[PDB]
Design a protein around this ligand. Sequence first.
Ligand SMILES: Nc1ncnc2c1ncn2[C@@H]1O[C@H](COP(=O)(O)OP(=O)(O)O)[C@@H](O)[C@H]1O
Ligand SMILES: [Mg+2]
Ligand SMILES: [Mg+2]
Length: 355
Amino acid sequence: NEVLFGIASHFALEGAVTGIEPYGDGHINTTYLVTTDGPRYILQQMNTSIFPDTVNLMRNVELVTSTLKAQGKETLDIVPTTSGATWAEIDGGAWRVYKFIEHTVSYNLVPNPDVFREAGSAFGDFQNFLSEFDASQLTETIAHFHDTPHRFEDFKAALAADKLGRAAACQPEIDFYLSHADQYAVVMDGLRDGSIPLRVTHNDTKLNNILMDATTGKARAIIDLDTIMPGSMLFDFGDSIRFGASTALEDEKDLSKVHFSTELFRAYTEGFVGELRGSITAREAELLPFSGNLLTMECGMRFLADYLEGDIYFATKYPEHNLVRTRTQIKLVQEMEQKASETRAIVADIMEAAR
Ligand SMILES: Nc1ncnc2c1ncn2[C@@H]1O[C@H](COP(=O)(O)OP(=O)(O)O)[C@@H](O)[C@H]1O
Ligand SMILES: [Mg+2]
Ligand SMILES: [Mg+2]
């Protein structure tokens, strides 16, 4: 608190500081709530282990937030250092301040389809108002993040190495990913040849990062912009479907409880396409369902790769944790495959309705 107040003094706060306490349930940044005799603020110590290049990350954040503010859209509002920087290095730490976005609630899992539709609307609105932004200006904060062919090379490397001798125990899981190999390059290929628009991508579309109004329930702002990068909005949509349209937790051991919900798929798509109708392309719309397949397979192969490497990337609570996780992702992709007729119809219906 002595140090915290000291850190706070580096920033152009518009109220005398009266308190500073840890805040929120995030686990990458170290997050504090700053109270003043006036407005409130978010103060964060950035994760420089994961994000060593703070200058480039804050440049990305500044570019996107500025575009939104210029257009009168609510977003993260950086509070500058006394020197006019967007962040400060203090005693071997990287710190930044945002205005506290007031009067919101957020979720840690999808409670129901209405909330999921509103999550869809939030990112559709995010995409819509960045549709004119030159996404290529953004640096790749985590290289190859949703480059599924790259992830598959990582997976194959982990399989070849088989450092723990675990491959013997997951042949069906391995064969699932090997057999789908010709599917991984669909979105990367479209970006490279222009058939799929290069857009801003958020890359952590979990609901924790979507603030909704505390009274109306309506989407308010997208936060947690650390992983903002160029890519396809399909990377974001696909991932939201992966975690959000599942009837189960990511590590559900009972696979009979794991299903791909077309109701939740419809809900997100209604919200998302409803805000992005004027910008979304024919090829994009066509790939909405498959984007769910793609990002789910990417995530699943990463879990299985981690299992084979001795669980070095994802936290685990028991020895087979990553294998259990890879299994839910496999189950979800199989249902998405089997429901392709339905989801295609859902998208087509939603597209025409939005007009
Ligand atoms: N500008 C802000 N206004 C209000 N709440 C915020 C703001 N920034 C972050 N939060 C809250 O702090 C939590 C963690 O912050 P976030 O930037 O998502 O960190 P992490 O990268 O660790 O997830 C969020 O889940 C959100 O509830
Ligand atoms: Mg977050
Ligand atoms: Mg984050």
